[PDB]
Amino acid sequence: NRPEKWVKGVCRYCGTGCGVLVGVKDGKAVAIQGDPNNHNAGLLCLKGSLLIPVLNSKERVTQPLVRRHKGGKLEPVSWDEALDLMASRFRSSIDMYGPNSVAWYGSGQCLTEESYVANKIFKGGFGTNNVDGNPRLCMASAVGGYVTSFGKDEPMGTYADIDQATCFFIIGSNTSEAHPVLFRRIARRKQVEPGVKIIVADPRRTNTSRIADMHVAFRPGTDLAFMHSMAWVIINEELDNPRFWQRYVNFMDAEGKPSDFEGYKAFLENYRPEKVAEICRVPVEQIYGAARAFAESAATMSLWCMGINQRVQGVFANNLIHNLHLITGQICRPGATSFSLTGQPNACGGVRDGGALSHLLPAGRAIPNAKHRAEMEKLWGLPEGRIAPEPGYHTVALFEALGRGDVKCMIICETNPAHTLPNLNKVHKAMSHPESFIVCIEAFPDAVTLEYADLVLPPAFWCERDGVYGCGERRYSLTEKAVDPPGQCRPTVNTLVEFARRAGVDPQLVNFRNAEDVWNEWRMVSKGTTYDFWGMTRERLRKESGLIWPCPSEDHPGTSLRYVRGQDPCVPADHPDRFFFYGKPDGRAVIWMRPAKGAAEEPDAEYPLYLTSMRVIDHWHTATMTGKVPELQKANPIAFVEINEEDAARTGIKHGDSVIVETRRDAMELPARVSDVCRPGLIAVPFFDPKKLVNKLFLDATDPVSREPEYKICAARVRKA
Numbered sequence: 001n002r003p004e005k006w007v008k009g010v011c012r013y014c015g016t017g018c019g020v021l022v023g024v025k026d027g028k029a030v031a032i033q034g035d036p037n038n039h040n041a042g043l044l045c046l047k048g049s050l051l052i053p054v055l056n057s058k059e060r061v062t063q064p065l066v067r068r069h070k071g072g073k074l075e076p077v078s079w080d081e082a083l084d085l086m087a088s089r090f091r092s093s094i095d096m097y098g099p100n101s102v103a104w105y106g107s108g109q110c111l112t113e114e115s116y117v118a119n120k121i122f123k124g125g126f127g128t129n130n131v132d133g134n135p136r137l138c139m140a141s142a143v144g145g146y147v148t149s150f151g152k153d154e155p156m157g158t159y160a161d162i163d164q165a166t167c168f169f170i171i172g173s174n175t176s177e178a179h180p181v182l183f184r185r186i187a188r189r190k191q192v193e194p195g196v197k198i199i200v201a202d203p204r205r206t207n208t209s210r211i212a213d214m215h216v217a218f219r220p221g222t223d224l225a226f227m228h229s230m231a232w233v234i235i236n237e238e239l240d241n242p243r244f245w246q247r248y249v250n251f252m253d254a255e256g257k258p259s260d261f262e263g264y265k266a267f268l269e270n271y272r273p274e275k276v277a278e279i280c281r282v283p284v285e286q287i288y289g290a291a292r293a294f295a296e297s298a299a300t301m302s303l304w305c306m307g308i309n310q311r312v313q314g315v316f317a318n319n320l321i322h323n324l325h326l327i328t329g330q331i332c333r334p335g336a337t338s339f340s341l342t343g344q345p346n347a348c349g350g351v352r353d354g355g356a357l358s359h360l361l362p363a364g365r366a367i368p369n370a371k372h373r374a375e376m377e378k379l380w381g382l383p384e385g386r387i388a389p390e391p392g393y394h395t396v397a398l399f400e401a402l403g404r405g406d407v408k409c410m411i412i413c414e415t416n417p418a419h420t421l422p423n424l425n426k427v428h429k430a431m432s433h434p435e436s437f438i439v440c441i442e443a444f445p446d447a448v449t450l451e452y453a454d455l456v457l458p459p460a461f462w463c464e465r466d467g468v469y470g471c472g473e474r475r476y477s478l479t480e481k482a483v484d485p486p487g488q489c490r491p492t493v494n495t496l497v498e499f500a501r502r503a504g505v506d507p508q509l510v511n512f513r514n515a516e517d518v519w520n521e522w523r524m525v526s527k528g529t530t531y532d533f534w535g536m537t538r539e540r541l542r543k544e545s546g547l548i549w550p551c552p553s554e555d556h557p558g559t560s561l562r563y564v565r566g567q568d569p570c571v572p573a574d575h576p577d578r579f580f581f582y583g584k585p586d587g588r589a590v591i592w593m594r595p596a597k598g599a600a601e602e603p604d605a606e607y608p609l610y611l612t613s614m615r616v617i618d619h620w621h622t623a624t625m626t627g628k629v630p631e632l633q634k635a636n637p638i639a640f641v642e643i644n645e646e647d648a649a650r651t652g653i654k655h656g657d658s659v660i661v662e663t664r665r666d667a668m669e670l671p672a673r674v675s676d677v678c679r680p681g682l683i684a685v686p687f688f689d690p691k692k693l694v695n696k697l698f699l700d701a702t703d704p705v706s707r708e709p710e711y712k713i714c715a716a717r718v719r720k721a
């Protein structure tokens, strides 16, 4: 027989956050199925379905490892020696150079409880705000977009809204490859109601566009002008919602000064369809088509991901999508919301909501805010002024600090920055600092980052321990422990606590035996904020297949529509208005007149092509997990470059040719896929291959608000090898 027992949890991959049931027999995982009671209704994509061979792989880091000297070989070392080595290095670096010589670099793949303990050890124990992580590379622009538009982070609706939307505006998102089960939910909606309209707006033509009524293949960087132009049509054709925006919206001009509807109208005159069509290189009727579909529809939902966020104008691009919903009032109703898609399984729970970035504090609190710091000192039992008043290093700046010698010790946890940070040649130099001490908490020995690690700790993987993942729709879901960790792997929650203790942190600060203990403190910390998930006890999370916050008591079901009287507990029952955007001081959301520009590095005579980077369905990021699954690995073993049919014809490049892709930063030989996927003037590479580190090619320029890099656009040339 196979499973004697089924253990409820969450898929280890995308922010769709599909609940899973792991079948165990004699301490070994033998089978997996979808949780029928979670939002995905028992459905998983092929990656999720093929998760047992990852969990059962023997190619794991199972003992502590030390590199005695730079450029030496990693060798085994005891857990006890590892931990003293780690704690004395961190302590004595603080002793010599102060708390800003140390840093935590974590991820949205860490359990909420791991990120919570790490964040706290550093900000409250060591007294440094050098806590960042990979969502900086991903969701930072959507956080900035939501906060500036609404005053609070995170979507105001849920995946349920897909079932009620009458129009989908899907932009900078290959939902088909990146959120498979979610894309199926959208396709399903369109099959139930064939009247549903879908606009997919992406310079590349992906499987996602194959269900669309319109595919807007705009020139990279010009979507902001595109979205201002849709607002132009909406207002020009009297398709806007004055009863909504007059009560619920404020306007901010190109300089961020208060304005009004007439000012908005005058600003949009800069973005007439005929002019914007030449800018974007699209038929003008696509502008009218998208705008009309969006505005005339009974309920419109937008969904976007990295095409929008991985941009120096990422925060501005987010605001422009919100503007559409605010001018039309396509918001705060079933099927009508502005829904950022999150990539990682726990960027939301672990890092965003938990405030595990350099400028943040848990549950919507901010570092520069005195009252907020005092709130946290009280909650964490800290003395007054213990939390530093200035932000630590954001991610790009962090590895710059490491390069200069400013940050001397670093913990890297559940991420592979030597593979995934932009401008890798600069980064690899930084990570080679001969006086740096780099500790890696990493499960798989083939992670390229380990070539820089001085110390490696073996962690419990996925459902080898328990913990909470917060997915893209504000759903917090428990994974219970299903199997024992192998070898000497330990849960990182416990690892972190033992390091803190040995490193001289006050024992009261890390008073946790397990993830259940830290969950209960984190609940307290959230209580009374607009994230309040006090109602999400361990027992409820054990019984339920996820709960959506706000969820302030044990008898509260959670919240689907934020900002709605009678739906959201943060809205007083006697609020005079049906909606309340309580993140802003007057209760009104904000339309932002953001000037449309381009990429930090635009094409020119010398480097005439846009170069982008993208997801492939068969591989998760650096493929240290998906690369262990033969059927996944065989489907896409190596990197390639997508080239437009018509650019290749004019240039003498045939499908299958080896070509050199060259930017200002590096050059790389790759096999060409010549098709109509990439619009003319655009090329595209995936980034899963460790033998073809494409981030060597990309520039490191960052959105000046969110500090998210522009992985999505740089300037390239191509020649035949």
Ligand SMILES: Nc1nc2c(c(=O)[nH]1)N[C@H]1C(S)=C(S)[C@@H](COP(=O)(O)OP(=O)(O)OC[C@H]3O[C@@H](n4cnc5c(=O)[nH]c(N)nc54)[C@H](O)[C@@H]3O)O[C@H]1N2
Pocket: 014, 015, 138, 171, 172, 173, 174, 175, 177, 178, 179, 201, 202, 203, 204, 206, 219, 220, 221, 222, 223, 305, 306, 307, 308, 342, 343, 344, 612, 613, 614, 615, 616, 617, 618, 619, 620, 621, 712, 713
């Ligand atoms: N299979 C798989 N699924 C995943 C992941 C994975 O690694 N593998 N990772 C997860 C994570 S962490 C994330 S963040 C998501 C990423 O999910 P997506 O963002 O949906 O995937 P990408 O291919 O990175 O998205 C880029 C899309 O934006 C487009 N784009 C490029 N330039 C522009 C532009 O100027 N404007 C606009 N509007 N679009 C542009 C690209 O053509 C591309 O089709 O996937 C998540 N799910």
Ligand SMILES: Nc1nc2c(c(=O)[nH]1)N[C@H]1C(S)=C(S)[C@@H](COP(=O)(O)OP(=O)(O)OC[C@H]3O[C@@H](n4cnc5c(=O)[nH]c(N)nc54)[C@H](O)[C@@H]3O)O[C@H]1N2
Pocket: 107, 109, 134, 135, 137, 138, 139, 306, 310, 343, 344, 413, 414, 415, 416, 417, 419, 420, 421, 440, 441, 442, 443, 444, 447, 459, 460, 461, 462, 613, 614, 615, 620, 621, 622, 623, 624, 625, 687, 694, 695, 698, 711, 712
């Ligand atoms: N060019 C380009 N670059 C990009 C992007 C892009 O679109 N284009 N996307 C960016 C985005 S959105 C993201 S999210 C980042 C993601 O980039 P990374 O986070 O660097 O990539 P992953 O492969 O998800 O790394 C997770 C790591 O954790 C290890 N691991 C797995 N389980 C465990 C565990 O239990 N404990 C520990 N300690 N480790 C574990 C895995 O082996 C793996 O090395 O990449 C960014 N980089």
Ligand code: SF4
Pocket: 011, 012, 013, 014, 015, 016, 017, 018, 043, 044, 045, 046, 047, 048, 049, 179, 180, 181, 182
């Ligand atoms: S859609 Fe994402 S969360 Fe769902 S099974 Fe596929 S990889 Fe896992």
Ligand SMILES: [O-][Cl+3]([O-])([O-])[O-]
Pocket: 066, 067, 068, 069, 085, 437, 454, 455
């Ligand atoms: O004690 Cl070390 O292996 O970081 O030189």
Ligand SMILES: [O-][Cl+3]([O-])([O-])[O-]
Pocket: 134, 135, 136, 137, 138, 139, 140, 141, 143, 347, 351, 352, 357
């Ligand atoms: O989405 Cl964040 O990069 O602010 O954690």
Ligand SMILES: [O-][Cl+3]([O-])([O-])[O-]
Pocket: 140, 141, 143, 144, 145, 147, 315, 357, 359, 705, 706, 707
């Ligand atoms: O509030 Cl941000 O994560 O855009 O810096």
Ligand SMILES: [O-][Cl+3]([O-])([O-])[O-]
Pocket: 143, 144, 147, 152, 153, 154, 352, 353, 355, 360, 363, 364, 365, 366
């Ligand atoms: O928008 Cl926050 O990252 O301050 O929760």
Ligand SMILES: [Mo]
Pocket: 137, 138, 139, 343, 344
């Ligand atoms: Mo991501």
